[PDB]
Paper text:
The PIM (proviral integration site for Moloney murine leukemia virus) family of protein kinases (PKs) includes three constitutively active serine/threonine kinases (PIM-1, PIM-2, and PIM-3) that regulate key biological processes, including cell survival, proliferation, differentiation, and apoptosis. In ARCs, an adenosine analogue heteroaromatic moiety and substrate peptide mimetic d-Arg-rich fragment are covalently tethered by a linker.
The peptide mimetic moiety of ARC-1411 was resolved in the complex with PIM-1 to a larger extent compared to the previously reported complex with PKAcα. The structure of the ARC-1411 complex with PIM-1 revealed a canonical type-1 inhibitor interaction of its pyrrolo-pyrimidine hinge binding moiety, forming the anticipated hydrogen bond of the pyrrolo nitrogen with the backbone carbonyl of the hinge residue E121. Remarkably, the first arginine moiety connected via an aliphatic linker to the ATP mimetic hinge binding motif engages with the glycine-rich loop (GRL) residue S46. The GRL itself assumed a folded conformation, which is often observed in PIM-1 inhibitor complexes where the phenylalanine (F49) is positioned at the tip of the GRL and flipped into the ATP binding pocket. The second arginine in ARC-1411 mimicked the interaction of the arginine in the key substrate position -3, which pointed into an acidic binding pocket lined by the αD residues D128 and D131. The following arginine in ARC-1411 formed polar interactions with D239 that were not present in the substrate complex, most likely increasing the affinity of ARC-1411. However, similar to the substrate residue R-4, the next arginine moiety in ARC-1411 pointed toward the solvent, but the following arginine mimicked again the substrate arginine in position -5, which is required for high-affinity substrate interactions. At this position, the arginine side chains formed an intricate network of polar interactions with residues located in αD (T134), αF (D234), and D170.
Residue numbers in the entry: 33 to 305
The structure:
Amino acid sequence: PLESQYQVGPLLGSGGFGSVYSGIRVSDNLPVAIKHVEKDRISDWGELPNGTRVPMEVVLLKKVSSGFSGVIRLLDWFERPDSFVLILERPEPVQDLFDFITERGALQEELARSFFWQVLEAVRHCHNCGVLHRDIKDENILIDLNRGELKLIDFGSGALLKDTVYTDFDGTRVYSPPEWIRYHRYHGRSAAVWSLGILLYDMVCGDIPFEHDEEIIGGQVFFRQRVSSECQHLIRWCLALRPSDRPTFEEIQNHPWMQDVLLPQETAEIHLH
């Protein structure tokens, strides 16, 4: 019985993803987020062990929601006549990374390193679970301000991970790679690495590097802030024009800029508390 298990609080936001409300699980007072998705707005459908027909978003969340990780966990879901309702983890207190960068500007490299490392671990977890997020960006990352933990949200543009070409894309354009702009084709891993270079630039410069198609395919990155030579190197490597010139996750995590990461608790004590 959905409406009696959850006290519905205020609207947290709405858009392409649906409508998300703050909530409290009535039994144990667990903070949750209650996401409503209209059936007309779901193009991508899948099914579970049961062979019951659900939004792809529910398939992907279940695949990643087992064990602890830097992914928002799906706690429950419900079908209504015109909608699905998803019950998600809600960190408290929380700020999305987009708002955090708006308020604080360009992040110190030590904080960007801690955040970028956690996003890499979260994206490895997705890939290891057979899930491609396809919309990695500051707006889809929550900061747990007391634990210093990042959580990935919004799998509504995601797909099962495959080794063959993708010819569909409904993620954020300006985090989309040049091969999509030019050819309407991409491979999952190398396109994820592009979106990670956009995100790292966003953290160390305070905004995304490209606005127009011509900048995305142009192959020049201009630094608007003071950024270390090792950080510029990693970013320009992630943003290689040719997908096969981009680093693997292993090569990113072994990059000299990535060494000596803070633990989440240290990150919260030094930068967040």
